[PDB]
Amino acid sequence: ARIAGINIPDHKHAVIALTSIYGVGKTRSKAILAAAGIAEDVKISELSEGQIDTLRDEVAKFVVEGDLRREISMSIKRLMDLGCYRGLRHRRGLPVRGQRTKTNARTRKGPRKP
Amino acid sequence: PRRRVIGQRKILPDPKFGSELLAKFVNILMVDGKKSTAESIVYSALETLAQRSGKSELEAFEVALENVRPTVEVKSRRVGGSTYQVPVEVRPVRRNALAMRWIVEAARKRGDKSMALRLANELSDAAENKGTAVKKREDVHRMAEANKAFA
Amino acid sequence: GQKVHPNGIRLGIVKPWNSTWFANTKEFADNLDSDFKVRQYLTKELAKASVSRIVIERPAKSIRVTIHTARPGIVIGKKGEDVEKLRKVVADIAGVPAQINIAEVRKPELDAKLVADSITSQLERRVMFRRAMKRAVQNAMRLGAKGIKVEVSGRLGGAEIARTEWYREGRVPLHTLRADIDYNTSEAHTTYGVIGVKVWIFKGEI
Amino acid sequence: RSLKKGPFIDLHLLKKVEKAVESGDKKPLRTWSRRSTIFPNMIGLTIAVHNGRQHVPVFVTDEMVGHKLGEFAPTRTYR
Amino acid sequence: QRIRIRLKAFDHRLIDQATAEIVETAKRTGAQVRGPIPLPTRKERFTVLISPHVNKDARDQYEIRTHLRLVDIVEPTEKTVDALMRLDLAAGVDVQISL
Amino acid sequence: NQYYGTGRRKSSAARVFIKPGNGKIVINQRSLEQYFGRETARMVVRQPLELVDMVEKLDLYITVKGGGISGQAGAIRHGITRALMEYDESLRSELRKAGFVTRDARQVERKKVGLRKARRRPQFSKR
Amino acid sequence: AKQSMKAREVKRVALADKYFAKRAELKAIISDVNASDEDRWNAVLKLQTLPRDSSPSRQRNRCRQTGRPHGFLRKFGLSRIKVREAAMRGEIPGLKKASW
RNA sequence: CGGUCCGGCCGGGAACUCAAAGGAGACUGCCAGUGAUAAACUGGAGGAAGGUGGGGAUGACGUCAAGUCAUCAUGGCCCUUACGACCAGGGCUACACACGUGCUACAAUGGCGCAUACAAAGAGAAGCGACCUCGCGAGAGCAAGCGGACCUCAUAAAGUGCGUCGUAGUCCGGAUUGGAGUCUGCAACUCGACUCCAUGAAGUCGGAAUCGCUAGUAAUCGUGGAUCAGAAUGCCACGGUG
Ligand SMILES: [Mg+2]
Ligand SMILES: [Mg+2]
Ligand SMILES: [Mg+2]
Ligand SMILES: [Mg+2]
Ligand SMILES: [Mg+2]
Ligand SMILES: [Mg+2]
Ligand SMILES: [Mg+2]
Ligand SMILES: [Mg+2]
C-alpha cells in the first residue's frame, strides 16, 4: 500500500493502519472507513487498488502530512512575530498552556544539566 | 512476635480438586486481591501442563515441587560486629511455601505471551529440574554447604 | 500531653447542652450568631451579678433565656425593673419575642465558672494568687466537693518568666465519663498580661 | 476560551477607540483594560496596555484581532 | 382524612418522650393511631483541625444526630384535633403537620 | 408453614425459606447460575447440602440484599444452615464442626484520620 | 481578620442584594435568551457600569465572630477553631464528639 | 393470600429484610493440662461472639524557653495627613536546579469494543434537578418530583461472557503543542475545569539508599462528602474483591 503523503502502510488492520498518517487519529480513521464503505477489522490483504484510491480521495479533504505540518508551524510563527505571550514561550522552549516550571516541565525544557 | 506466640491461619481448600496446597498456590500468584483472574490462570496452566506431560494434574504439580523443595537455608545473625550466615534445617510447612514462591517469581520473570504459558513452561522446567526456580534452590544450597562450619 | 475538654466529652453522658434548640442548615448558623450575640450582651451587663451559665432554647418563633445566677436579687432588681430592660433588648438582638427565666445557684463555691471568675477578679484586685487558689479549694472542700483542682497560668505575680501553678484536694477522675466534673475557664486581664484560671470540681459519680 | 455569545470589551476603552477614529490618531492611549478582545475597528492605533507598573505601547495590527490586549504586555521580568 | 406528624429532634430520649405525649393523648381522646414509626436518623459528621496553626493529623470528629419519628392519626375527631393542638411539647422538638 | 433461617456476612443479608421436594434454587427471581458468574461462589451455597443430605430432597426460596458476590453467597450459606436447624435442631453438632453456624463478624475497618487507609500510614521522611 | 476586611464584606452584601438579586439577574437571563435580541442589546455593556462588589461570587465566606477567611463551615457559619470552642461549651446543639 | 397493563403495582399482610428506642449476652464462668494448691497461660465444650471478641473516643506528672502575637485574646515596643484607608492592573502560578509527598505508567493478572451480575455511605431550595428534545461531545432549551427511608445527584467499578490485538516503544503509555469549542463568572490573556479533532515526549520496572502494613489488614476497584460561583491526583469518609 501507499496513501496520501508518501507513507507505505503496514499489513495491520485498516483503522490502526491509517492512523500512521500525520493528521488522522482514531476518529478520522473510523469515519474514513465509514465514508468509503470498508471494514475496520480487515488487513491490507484482499484490499485491491480500486479500494485504495477511494480512501485516498476521502483523506484528501483534510490537510494531512507536509501540507498540515507547515500550517501548524505557520500559526507558531504568527504568534512569535506578533509579540504575544503564547509566542514568547514557543521562542523560549517553555510550557505555553500555563503549566508549572518551578519543577516538572521536562517535556518542553528537555533533559536537565547542572 | 516478640512475646505473642501466634499459630497459623487454616485456609479454605481449592474450589475444584479440594487441595489445601493449591489453595495456598492460588493465593501466592494472586495479585491486587483478584482471586478470580488468579485461579483462572492456575487452572489454564494446569490444563496446558497435565495434557503436555501425561494427565495426573495433582501429580504433575507434585513432581515439579520436589525439585524446588529445599532442605537447609542460612540465617543472617550478627554476633561480634561481623555477620554470620548460620545453616538451619527448614520445616515441612515452609518447605512447600518457599518452593511455591519461587515458581511464581521465576514465571513472572519469563518472556512468554501469557501467564498461563509462563506458569506452565516454568512447571515443565522444574519437573525436569532446568529452570530459574531450581537454580534459586541451588544458590540456597551452595550457601548452606559453605557456611557448614557454623552449624 | 493535651487534655480533652471535660464538659465537651461529657455532653450526652452526664452533662447537658447550653443550647437545646433545633434548626435545619438554613437557620442553624444565624441562630448560633444570635445566641453568641445575646450571651455576649448578658455577660457584659450582669458582670457583677455572678452569672455561671446561660441556657438558650428556641420554642417556635421565640427565645427562652435561662440565666443561672448566685445573685438573682440583683439580676431581677426592684420588681422586674432589671428583667424587663434586659428582655426588651434580648428581643432586639434576636429579632423574635423574648422571655427571660432566672435559675438560682445555691452553693456558688461549688460552681466552676463562679470559682474561676472569683479568682480572675481577685488577681485583677492585686491579691496574691497562692491565697486565691487555697481559699477557692478550702471553701469548695468544706461545702461538700468530693474533689477540686485549680490552675493559674502565665506571668504569676508580674514575673518575667511565666509559670503554670496548680493546687488539688480530693478525687478528680478526669477519665471516668460517669463522673460529675464541672469545668470552666476565666481570664484575669492584668497590668503585666493575661492569667488563665482553670477550675475542675468533682461532685460525685453517676 | 469564553462563550461565543458576544465577545467582551470595556466601555471606558470602547469610547476611547471611537474618540480617536473621528478626531484622528493621538499619543499612546493610556488604558488598564487587559481583559478586552481586539476588534477590527482598532487596527492602526497605539494602545498603551498596563503590565503592572508601566504602559506597554502596542501598535494594533490585523492579526492581533481575536486575542486579548494582555498578551502583548509582559508581566514577569525574567533575566 | 389523615393527619401526618413528623417529629425531628437532636436528642433521642426527648423525641420518644414527646412522641408518647402525642400517641397517648390521641388514643385517650379516641382516635385510630398508627406508629410511633422510627424513621432513619441522619448523621451529619464534621472533621475540624484541633490546632490553631499546622498539625494536619491533629483533628476532632463530631456528629449531629437528627432523630426522626412518624405518628399517623387516622381519625380526625374534634375531641382529638383540639386536644393535640393544646399540647405543650418540648422546645427542642420540631413538629411538622401534614394534612 | 415454611422453614426460615436468617444469615448475614459483611454488608450482605439473606433470607432463607425451606420447603421439601426437588432441588431448585431461586435467588431474587433468578436461577442459581444466572445470578452468580463465579463457580467458587456457587459451591459455597452447595456446602450446607453435603453434611446434611439433599439432591432433590428440599427446595429453597432465597432473597439476598447488599454487599457483593462472595458476601451475598456467604450470607445465604449461614441462612440455609439456620433454616436447617429450624427443621431438625439435632443437625447443630454436624453444622458446628463445618463452621457455618458462626456469623462471620469480620466487617471492613473504618478509615482513620492521618492515615491513608484503615491501617496504611503515609510514607515517612527522616530528611 | 482586619476591621477594614470585615467592612469590605458588609459592602459586598449591601450591594449583592441592591443590584445582583433584583436588577442584574434580569439583564443576565436576557444575555442568554436566544429567542429575542441577538445584536442590539447593550445588556453585557451596562453590566460593567454596575459596581463590582455587587457580584455574589465576589464575597468570601468568613468566620462570623473573628473574620477568618479559611477553615469555614457553612452549617455553623464559623471557622474550625471557634466551632471547637463553642462545641466544647455545649453552645452548638446536638453536636458531640463522634466515634464509629 | 384475592387481581394483573406482570412493575410490590393495588386491596391486603404484620411474618421476614430493614429502620431505632429499650433489654439479654462473655465473667477465665465451666472442664482439662502446665504453673509455688497462687496469679496467669495453653487447649477444649457450650456459644453468634472467648480470653481487653473487632474498631473508635479517652493522651497522667512531665520533656523539647517545641509550634501558633497572621483565627482570636493580650503586657510591652513601634507607625498615627501613615506601617492606616479606597481603587485598577499585576504577583502568590516566575524557573539554571536540589529535596519531600502523591498521581499515572512502563502493558497481556493487560489495552479496546459490545453485552452484563452485585454495594455501602453520603449531599440537596440563591439547591439536587429527572423525563423529553437538540448536539459526535462538553453541554443547551424545556420542564416533573423533592426541604426528602417517597424525589434527584447516580450508569458503582473491579468481576463475568464474547471478539480483537500477539511481545512490538506496540491497538502499551498518555505528556506537550496547533485548531475549534463548552460551562461558571462583571471578566478565564497572565492563570479554570471540561469536550471534540489532530499531535503521540519520556518510560520495556528504577543505583546507593529507604517506607507502610500482622486480617477483613496489606494490595486493588469504584462511591460519596467538607471547602466551593467555578476550580481534587490533596484531605475526610464508604463498601467491593481479598
Ligand atoms: Mg497520529
Ligand atoms: Mg481585630
Ligand atoms: Mg470564593
Ligand atoms: Mg442495642
Ligand atoms: Mg481508659
Ligand atoms: Mg522558640
Ligand atoms: Mg490508549
Ligand atoms: Mg499492631
Tab-separated table of all heavy atoms in Angstrom, chain C residues 97-135:
chain	number	residue	atom	x	y	z
C	97	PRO	N	-39.798	37.451	69.777
C	97	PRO	CA	-40.131	37.801	71.169
C	97	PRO	C	-39.261	37.053	72.182
C	97	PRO	O	-38.890	35.893	71.957
C	97	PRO	CB	-41.615	37.435	71.286
C	97	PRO	CG	-41.838	36.410	70.250
C	97	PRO	CD	-40.955	36.811	69.112
C	98	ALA	N	-38.915	37.747	73.279
C	98	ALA	CA	-38.050	37.221	74.331
C	98	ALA	C	-38.757	36.951	75.671
C	98	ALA	O	-39.728	37.632	76.021
C	98	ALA	CB	-36.866	38.155	74.535
C	99	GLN	N	-38.247	35.947	76.410
C	99	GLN	CA	-38.722	35.523	77.726
C	99	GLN	C	-37.510	35.076	78.559
C	99	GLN	O	-36.898	34.045	78.261
C	99	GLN	CB	-39.756	34.386	77.603
C	99	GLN	CG	-40.428	34.022	78.931
C	99	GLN	CD	-40.892	32.585	79.009
C	99	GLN	OE1	-41.232	31.935	78.006
C	99	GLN	NE2	-40.953	32.064	80.223
C	100	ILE	N	-37.163	35.864	79.590
C	100	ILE	CA	-36.026	35.575	80.459
C	100	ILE	C	-36.469	34.912	81.759
C	100	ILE	O	-37.308	35.466	82.466
C	100	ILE	CB	-35.154	36.844	80.682
C	100	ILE	CG1	-34.349	37.190	79.415
C	100	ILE	CG2	-34.230	36.699	81.894
C	100	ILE	CD1	-33.638	38.542	79.446
C	101	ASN	N	-35.905	33.730	82.065
C	101	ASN	CA	-36.140	32.963	83.293
C	101	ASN	C	-34.859	32.996	84.119
C	101	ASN	O	-33.777	32.928	83.547
C	101	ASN	CB	-36.496	31.505	82.979
C	101	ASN	CG	-37.785	31.304	82.235
C	101	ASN	OD1	-38.716	32.120	82.287
C	101	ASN	ND2	-37.879	30.174	81.554
C	102	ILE	N	-34.969	33.078	85.447
C	102	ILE	CA	-33.802	33.113	86.319
C	102	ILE	C	-33.725	31.851	87.200
C	102	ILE	O	-34.651	31.563	87.968
C	102	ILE	CB	-33.748	34.450	87.117
C	102	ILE	CG1	-33.300	35.613	86.221
C	102	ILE	CG2	-32.849	34.366	88.351
C	102	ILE	CD1	-34.411	36.410	85.620
C	103	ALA	N	-32.613	31.103	87.071
C	103	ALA	CA	-32.328	29.899	87.857
C	103	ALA	C	-31.343	30.256	88.961
C	103	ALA	O	-30.374	30.988	88.719
C	103	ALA	CB	-31.753	28.811	86.971
C	104	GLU	N	-31.607	29.767	90.180
C	104	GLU	CA	-30.781	30.085	91.347
C	104	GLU	C	-29.606	29.145	91.514
C	104	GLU	O	-29.763	27.931	91.399
C	104	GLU	CB	-31.637	30.134	92.622
C	104	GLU	CG	-30.986	30.874	93.777
C	104	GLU	CD	-31.889	31.050	94.980
C	104	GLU	OE1	-32.676	32.025	94.999
C	104	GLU	OE2	-31.807	30.212	95.910
C	105	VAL	N	-28.429	29.717	91.792
C	105	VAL	CA	-27.202	28.955	92.040
C	105	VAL	C	-27.020	28.925	93.577
C	105	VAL	O	-26.514	29.884	94.161
C	105	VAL	CB	-25.962	29.498	91.263
C	105	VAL	CG1	-24.721	28.659	91.550
C	105	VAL	CG2	-26.223	29.531	89.765
C	106	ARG	N	-27.473	27.839	94.234
C	106	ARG	CA	-27.463	27.723	95.701
C	106	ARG	C	-26.084	27.906	96.347
C	106	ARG	O	-25.866	28.887	97.066
C	106	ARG	CB	-28.109	26.402	96.166
C	106	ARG	CG	-29.288	26.597	97.118
C	106	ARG	CD	-30.453	25.693	96.773
C	106	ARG	NE	-31.016	26.000	95.457
C	106	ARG	CZ	-32.005	26.864	95.244
C	106	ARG	NH1	-32.558	27.517	96.260
C	106	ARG	NH2	-32.452	27.080	94.013
C	107	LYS	N	-25.184	26.952	96.094
C	107	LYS	CA	-23.818	26.846	96.584
C	107	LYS	C	-22.877	27.328	95.436
C	107	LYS	O	-22.554	26.546	94.533
C	107	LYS	CB	-23.557	25.381	97.015
C	107	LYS	CG	-24.508	24.868	98.106
C	107	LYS	CD	-24.075	23.529	98.682
C	107	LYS	CE	-24.963	22.391	98.247
C	107	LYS	NZ	-24.507	21.095	98.812
C	108	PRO	N	-22.500	28.633	95.405
C	108	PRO	CA	-21.651	29.124	94.303
C	108	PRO	C	-20.185	28.728	94.424
C	108	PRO	O	-19.448	28.810	93.435
C	108	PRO	CB	-21.842	30.641	94.343
C	108	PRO	CG	-22.274	30.949	95.708
C	108	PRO	CD	-22.801	29.709	96.370
C	109	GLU	N	-19.767	28.281	95.633
C	109	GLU	CA	-18.402	27.830	95.916
C	109	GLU	C	-18.156	26.457	95.309
C	109	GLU	O	-17.039	25.937	95.392
C	109	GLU	CB	-18.123	27.830	97.428
C	109	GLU	CG	-17.976	29.227	98.013
C	109	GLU	CD	-18.885	29.525	99.190
C	109	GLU	OE1	-20.124	29.387	99.040
C	109	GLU	OE2	-18.355	29.890	100.266
C	110	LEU	N	-19.212	25.888	94.685
C	110	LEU	CA	-19.225	24.598	94.006
C	110	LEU	C	-19.490	24.733	92.498
C	110	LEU	O	-19.644	23.723	91.808
C	110	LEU	CB	-20.224	23.634	94.672
C	110	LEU	CG	-19.924	23.220	96.109
C	110	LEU	CD1	-20.986	22.288	96.634
C	110	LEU	CD2	-18.584	22.538	96.221
C	111	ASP	N	-19.512	25.977	91.984
C	111	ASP	CA	-19.701	26.243	90.557
C	111	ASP	C	-18.367	26.631	89.918
C	111	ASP	O	-17.737	27.597	90.359
C	111	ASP	CB	-20.763	27.332	90.301
C	111	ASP	CG	-21.301	27.321	88.875
C	111	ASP	OD1	-20.531	27.671	87.937
C	111	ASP	OD2	-22.485	26.956	88.689
C	112	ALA	N	-17.948	25.884	88.872
C	112	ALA	CA	-16.698	26.112	88.159
C	112	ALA	C	-16.565	27.551	87.651
C	112	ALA	O	-15.696	28.261	88.141
C	112	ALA	CB	-16.542	25.110	87.025
C	113	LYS	N	-17.476	28.014	86.772
C	113	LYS	CA	-17.441	29.366	86.215
C	113	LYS	C	-17.388	30.454	87.296
C	113	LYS	O	-16.645	31.416	87.135
C	113	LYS	CB	-18.592	29.587	85.211
C	113	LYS	CG	-18.477	30.857	84.365
C	113	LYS	CD	-17.294	30.862	83.401
C	113	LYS	CE	-16.920	32.268	82.995
C	113	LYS	NZ	-15.813	32.286	82.007
C	114	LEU	N	-18.105	30.266	88.419
C	114	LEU	CA	-18.119	31.233	89.517
C	114	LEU	C	-16.826	31.259	90.302
C	114	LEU	O	-16.316	32.351	90.562
C	114	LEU	CB	-19.322	31.044	90.439
C	114	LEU	CG	-20.638	31.509	89.856
C	114	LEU	CD1	-21.794	30.975	90.647
C	114	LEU	CD2	-20.696	33.005	89.770
C	115	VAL	N	-16.278	30.072	90.657
C	115	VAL	CA	-14.997	29.937	91.372
C	115	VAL	C	-13.900	30.579	90.513
C	115	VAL	O	-13.101	31.364	91.031
C	115	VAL	CB	-14.675	28.451	91.714
C	115	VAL	CG1	-13.228	28.268	92.162
C	115	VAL	CG2	-15.634	27.916	92.773
C	116	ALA	N	-13.922	30.281	89.189
C	116	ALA	CA	-12.996	30.787	88.176
C	116	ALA	C	-13.071	32.302	88.046
C	116	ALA	O	-12.025	32.946	88.072
C	116	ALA	CB	-13.269	30.127	86.833
C	117	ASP	N	-14.293	32.874	87.929
C	117	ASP	CA	-14.488	34.324	87.800
C	117	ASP	C	-14.046	35.052	89.052
C	117	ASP	O	-13.560	36.173	88.953
C	117	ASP	CB	-15.946	34.691	87.437
C	117	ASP	CG	-16.377	34.435	85.986
C	117	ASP	OD1	-15.519	34.564	85.070
C	117	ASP	OD2	-17.586	34.176	85.759
C	118	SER	N	-14.188	34.399	90.221
C	118	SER	CA	-13.782	34.914	91.531
C	118	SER	C	-12.255	35.078	91.580
C	118	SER	O	-11.769	36.169	91.894
C	118	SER	CB	-14.258	33.980	92.645
C	118	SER	OG	-13.842	34.436	93.922
C	119	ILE	N	-11.507	34.000	91.235
C	119	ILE	CA	-10.045	34.000	91.198
C	119	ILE	C	-9.554	35.073	90.212
C	119	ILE	O	-8.681	35.858	90.564
C	119	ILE	CB	-9.469	32.578	90.918
C	119	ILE	CG1	-9.779	31.621	92.087
C	119	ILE	CG2	-7.958	32.618	90.641
C	119	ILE	CD1	-9.683	30.158	91.768
C	120	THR	N	-10.170	35.143	89.015
C	120	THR	CA	-9.880	36.123	87.967
C	120	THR	C	-10.025	37.558	88.512
C	120	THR	O	-9.100	38.357	88.359
C	120	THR	CB	-10.731	35.790	86.723
C	120	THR	OG1	-9.904	35.109	85.781
C	120	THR	CG2	-11.401	37.013	86.065
C	121	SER	N	-11.154	37.853	89.191
C	121	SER	CA	-11.456	39.167	89.761
C	121	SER	C	-10.508	39.546	90.885
C	121	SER	O	-10.174	40.728	91.021
C	121	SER	CB	-12.905	39.236	90.236
C	121	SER	OG	-13.786	39.199	89.127
C	122	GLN	N	-10.073	38.546	91.682
C	122	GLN	CA	-9.154	38.725	92.804
C	122	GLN	C	-7.753	39.105	92.342
C	122	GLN	O	-7.116	39.949	92.973
C	122	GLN	CB	-9.117	37.467	93.673
C	122	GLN	CG	-10.293	37.370	94.634
C	122	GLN	CD	-10.236	36.155	95.513
C	122	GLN	OE1	-9.392	35.260	95.348
C	122	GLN	NE2	-11.147	36.102	96.477
C	123	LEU	N	-7.273	38.495	91.241
C	123	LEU	CA	-5.954	38.776	90.683
C	123	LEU	C	-5.917	40.195	90.141
C	123	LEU	O	-4.928	40.897	90.332
C	123	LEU	CB	-5.577	37.760	89.595
C	123	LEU	CG	-5.567	36.275	89.988
C	123	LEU	CD1	-5.267	35.397	88.800
C	123	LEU	CD2	-4.604	35.993	91.119
C	124	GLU	N	-7.028	40.638	89.531
C	124	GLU	CA	-7.194	41.988	88.994
C	124	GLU	C	-7.266	43.030	90.130
C	124	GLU	O	-7.065	44.215	89.880
C	124	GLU	CB	-8.432	42.069	88.074
C	124	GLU	CG	-8.320	41.210	86.823
C	124	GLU	CD	-9.453	41.365	85.829
C	124	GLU	OE1	-9.541	42.446	85.206
C	124	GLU	OE2	-10.238	40.404	85.656
C	125	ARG	N	-7.534	42.577	91.375
C	125	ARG	CA	-7.593	43.408	92.582
C	125	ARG	C	-6.210	43.441	93.282
C	125	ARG	O	-6.078	44.010	94.373
C	125	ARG	CB	-8.658	42.875	93.561
C	125	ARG	CG	-10.107	43.113	93.168
C	125	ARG	CD	-10.978	42.894	94.392
C	125	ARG	NE	-12.407	42.941	94.092
C	125	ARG	CZ	-13.147	41.873	93.814
C	125	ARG	NH1	-12.602	40.662	93.799
C	125	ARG	NH2	-14.441	42.004	93.555
C	126	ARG	N	-5.195	42.825	92.637
C	126	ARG	CA	-3.792	42.710	93.067
C	126	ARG	C	-3.642	41.829	94.337
C	126	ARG	O	-2.742	42.059	95.156
C	126	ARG	CB	-3.077	44.092	93.201
C	126	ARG	CG	-3.119	44.972	91.942
C	126	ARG	CD	-1.845	45.032	91.105
C	126	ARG	NE	-0.910	46.051	91.575
C	126	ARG	CZ	0.042	46.592	90.823
C	126	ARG	NH1	0.179	46.231	89.554
C	126	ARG	NH2	0.860	47.502	91.331
C	127	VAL	N	-4.507	40.796	94.478
C	127	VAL	CA	-4.409	39.845	95.584
C	127	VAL	C	-3.480	38.685	95.182
C	127	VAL	O	-3.389	38.360	93.996
C	127	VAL	CB	-5.786	39.409	96.154
C	127	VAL	CG1	-6.067	37.912	95.985
C	127	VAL	CG2	-5.894	39.808	97.610
C	128	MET	N	-2.763	38.104	96.155
C	128	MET	CA	-1.827	37.003	95.906
C	128	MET	C	-2.509	35.757	95.362
C	128	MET	O	-3.510	35.310	95.919
C	128	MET	CB	-0.986	36.695	97.153
C	128	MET	CG	0.259	37.558	97.241
C	128	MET	SD	0.981	37.671	98.896
C	128	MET	CE	2.489	38.623	98.517
C	129	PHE	N	-1.990	35.236	94.240
C	129	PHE	CA	-2.531	34.072	93.537
C	129	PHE	C	-2.596	32.804	94.399
C	129	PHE	O	-3.609	32.105	94.360
C	129	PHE	CB	-1.782	33.818	92.211
C	129	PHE	CG	-0.396	33.229	92.305
C	129	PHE	CD1	-0.174	31.886	92.024
C	129	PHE	CD2	0.692	34.021	92.656
C	129	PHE	CE1	1.109	31.345	92.101
C	129	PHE	CE2	1.975	33.479	92.736
C	129	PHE	CZ	2.176	32.145	92.452
C	130	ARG	N	-1.544	32.532	95.191
C	130	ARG	CA	-1.489	31.364	96.066
C	130	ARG	C	-2.588	31.392	97.142
C	130	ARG	O	-3.113	30.335	97.493
C	130	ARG	CB	-0.086	31.177	96.660
C	130	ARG	CG	0.860	30.431	95.717
C	130	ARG	CD	2.325	30.529	96.109
C	130	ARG	NE	2.909	31.824	95.746
C	130	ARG	CZ	4.172	32.003	95.358
C	130	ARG	NH1	5.000	30.968	95.268
C	130	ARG	NH2	4.611	33.217	95.048
C	131	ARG	N	-2.982	32.601	97.607
C	131	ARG	CA	-4.057	32.799	98.591
C	131	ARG	C	-5.408	32.518	97.932
C	131	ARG	O	-6.227	31.796	98.498
C	131	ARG	CB	-4.045	34.234	99.168
C	131	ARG	CG	-2.843	34.546	100.041
C	131	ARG	CD	-2.794	36.014	100.420
C	131	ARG	NE	-2.542	36.205	101.847
C	131	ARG	CZ	-1.338	36.297	102.400
C	131	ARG	NH1	-0.245	36.209	101.649
C	131	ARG	NH2	-1.215	36.471	103.709
C	132	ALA	N	-5.616	33.077	96.722
C	132	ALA	CA	-6.828	32.933	95.918
C	132	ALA	C	-7.129	31.464	95.643
C	132	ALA	O	-8.263	31.029	95.849
C	132	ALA	CB	-6.667	33.687	94.610
C	133	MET	N	-6.099	30.702	95.222
C	133	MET	CA	-6.162	29.277	94.922
C	133	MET	C	-6.549	28.492	96.156
C	133	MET	O	-7.536	27.756	96.115
C	133	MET	CB	-4.810	28.783	94.417
C	133	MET	CG	-4.592	29.023	92.954
C	133	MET	SD	-2.856	28.824	92.486
C	133	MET	CE	-2.651	27.072	92.661
C	134	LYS	N	-5.787	28.668	97.263
C	134	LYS	CA	-6.017	27.980	98.539
C	134	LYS	C	-7.414	28.267	99.106
C	134	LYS	O	-8.090	27.325	99.514
C	134	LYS	CB	-4.899	28.290	99.550
C	134	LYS	CG	-4.636	27.161	100.556
C	134	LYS	CD	-3.278	27.333	101.268
C	134	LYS	CE	-3.301	27.003	102.752
C	134	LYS	NZ	-3.335	25.540	103.016
C	135	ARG	N	-7.871	29.539	99.056
C	135	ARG	CA	-9.210	29.924	99.523
C	135	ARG	C	-10.292	29.224	98.708
C	135	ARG	O	-11.245	28.688	99.285
C	135	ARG	CB	-9.417	31.454	99.497
C	135	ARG	CG	-8.774	32.154	100.683
C	135	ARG	CD	-8.821	33.673	100.644
C	135	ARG	NE	-7.790	34.247	101.523
C	135	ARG	CZ	-7.924	34.470	102.835
C	135	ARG	NH1	-9.069	34.187	103.453
C	135	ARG	NH2	-6.916	34.977	103.535
